[PDB]
Every structure is written in structure tokens, then in C-alpha cells.
Design an enzyme around this catalytic site. Structure first.
Site, PDB file in Angstrom:
ATOM      1  N   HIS A 169       8.235  -0.527   3.158  1.00  0.00           N
ATOM      2  CA  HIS A 169       8.009   0.289   4.355  1.00  0.00           C
ATOM      3  C   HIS A 169       8.281   1.793   4.189  1.00  0.00           C
ATOM      4  O   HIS A 169       8.657   2.242   3.108  1.00  0.00           O
ATOM      5  CB  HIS A 169       8.792  -0.270   5.555  1.00  0.00           C
ATOM      6  CG  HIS A 169       8.562  -1.726   5.812  1.00  0.00           C
ATOM      7  ND1 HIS A 169       7.506  -2.196   6.571  1.00  0.00           N
ATOM      8  CD2 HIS A 169       9.251  -2.822   5.417  1.00  0.00           C
ATOM      9  CE1 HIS A 169       7.554  -3.511   6.620  1.00  0.00           C
ATOM     10  NE2 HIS A 169       8.609  -3.919   5.934  1.00  0.00           N
ATOM     11  N   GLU A 182      12.458 -11.013  -0.385  1.00  0.00           N
ATOM     12  CA  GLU A 182      13.037 -10.918   0.944  1.00  0.00           C
ATOM     13  C   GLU A 182      14.511 -11.270   0.804  1.00  0.00           C
ATOM     14  O   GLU A 182      14.856 -12.412   0.515  1.00  0.00           O
ATOM     15  CB  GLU A 182      12.349 -11.883   1.906  1.00  0.00           C
ATOM     16  CG  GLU A 182      10.899 -11.541   2.206  1.00  0.00           C
ATOM     17  CD  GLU A 182      10.754 -10.579   3.368  1.00  0.00           C
ATOM     18  OE1 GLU A 182       9.609 -10.352   3.813  1.00  0.00           O
ATOM     19  OE2 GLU A 182      11.785 -10.054   3.840  1.00  0.00           O
TER      20      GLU A 182
END
Ligand SMILES: [Zn+2]
Ligand SMILES: [Zn+2]
Length: 214
Positions: free
Chosen positions: A12, A177
Site C-alpha cells: 500500500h 500476510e
């Protein structure tokens, strides 16, 4: 493993605008959004800061090992590259390993990590070395005391076809993750400098572990 090339991608951007809805290739024939804002803990600690801060620690440790490194982005306060560009940046460096960092926004009951890898494979690298990478990273994250996710993926692993960063990779590449930001225990780790260092040390092990197989 000194002199080897690792591409590090803190998932991001530090900031977004309408341009993140721009369509970019998926690497499997479709398009998806250039970026996504990412999730955050209940107290407002953002995924993008978590991955940035953890990536910096990962970068520092690898650098100390003599490993060459590059980041997908250089700040946590402005727009960053789209998801296809982050794969292209990596490919241009022909790295020995590529690692992308993310944190999930799942059910509060779930916690722990899962390692994503491209499946079904679009090349020989995705079919072999990348799977080996994912397995090694999973074992190292586990051996470091990071619990495997029990609510997503299977056994801390997840074959994905929807991730552009993974689909477009031509060199060993996994997307980790690290845990669930919506989980109180996981977020306690993520919101702490100590926890982010533990995450980073575990990552170093997984990366160094795989680089050693080259
Ligand atoms: Zn933010
Ligand atoms: Zn993310």
C-alpha cells in the site's frame, strides 16, 4: 548470501487519491485497481504504516548481512506505485527473492500469518522456487513464534491467482500476510516496535533460509 538481491515491498501507499482506482493489469488477462488503501487496527494504526515500519527493519537486517535491497516505495506519506509497477520494478532487478508485506482485516477471532504464492503458476519460477520460498518462509515464521492463521488459507499457505504482484513476478516472489489487524493479540504486536522487530527477524530467517538454497 552476501551480494544477493532482495526486493522488499511494503504493501500500500502512505497516501491515496482517486487515481488508485485506475485500472492496471492483473497478469492473468483482466484488470484490477491500481492500489487499495489497506486496513487498520481498531485503534487506527494503519496497514500501510505497519508494512512500511516492518519493511524498514527487514531492510536494515538484510543490509547488515551484505544482502542488496530495494524498496517498492520510499515513504509513508505520499502516493506509491500501482500493484503491477511494483512487480515490474522487482523484475527489472532480477532478484534472488521478492517479499511483499501485508496485514489482514479479517474476523476478530482469527489471528496469525499466511504466506501467499502464485497458483496456478504462470512460469517455471512460480511453479518451483517460489513455492519452495513460501514453504521455507512459513516454517521460519512458525519457528519464530508467529502462529499460523487458522481462519484463512491452509497450514499458513495460500495459492492465489488474484494477486498482480505475484502473477506478474518472473523471479522468486511471495506475499506475506503477517497477521490480523482486527485481532487484539496480533494488533498488540503490530502496534509495537518490539513486535515489528520480531516480525522482521522472522522474515529475515525465511529470506536468508531461501537465499541459502541458491
Ligand atoms: Zn493512512
Ligand atoms: Zn494489504
Amino acid at each position: 548470501i552476501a551480494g544477493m538481491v532482495v526486493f522488499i515491498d511494503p504493501g500500500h501507499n502512505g497516501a491515496n487519491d482517486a487515481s488508485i482506482g485506475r485500472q492496471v493489469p492483473t497478469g492473468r488477462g483482466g484488470t484490477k485497481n491500481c492500489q487499495a488503501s489497506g486496513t487498520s487496527t481498531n485503534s487506527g494504526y494503519p496497514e500501510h504504516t505497519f508494512t512500511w515500519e516492518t519493511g524498514l527493519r527487514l531492510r536494515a537486517a538484510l543490509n547488515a548481512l551484505g544482502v542488496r535491497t530495494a524498496l517498492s516505495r520510499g515513504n509513508d506519506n505520499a502516493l506509491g506505485p500501482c500493484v503491477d509497477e511494483r512487480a515490474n520494478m522487482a523484475n527489472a532487478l532480477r532478484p534472488n527473492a521478492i517479499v511483499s508485506l501485508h496485514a489482514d482485516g479479517g474476523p476478530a477471532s482469527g489471528r496469525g500469518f499466511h504466506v501467499n504464492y502464485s497458483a496456478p503458476p504462470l512460469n517455471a519460477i512460480q511453479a518451483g522456487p517460489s513455492v519452495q520460498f513460501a514453504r521455507i518462509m512459513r516454517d521460519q515464521l512458525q519457528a519464530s513464534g508467529i502462529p499460523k492463521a487458522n481462519y484463512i488459507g491452509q497450514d499458513g499457505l495460500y495459492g492465489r491467482s488474484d494477486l498482480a504482484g505475484l502473477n506478474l513476478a518472473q523471479y522468486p516472489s511471495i506475499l506475506v500476510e503477517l497477521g490480523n489487524m482486527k485481532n487484539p493479540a496480533d494488533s498488540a504486536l503490530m502496534e509495537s516496535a518490539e513486535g515489528r522487530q520480531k516480525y522482521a527477524n522472522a522474515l529475515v530467517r525465511g529470506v536468508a533460509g531461501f537465499l541459502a538454497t541458491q
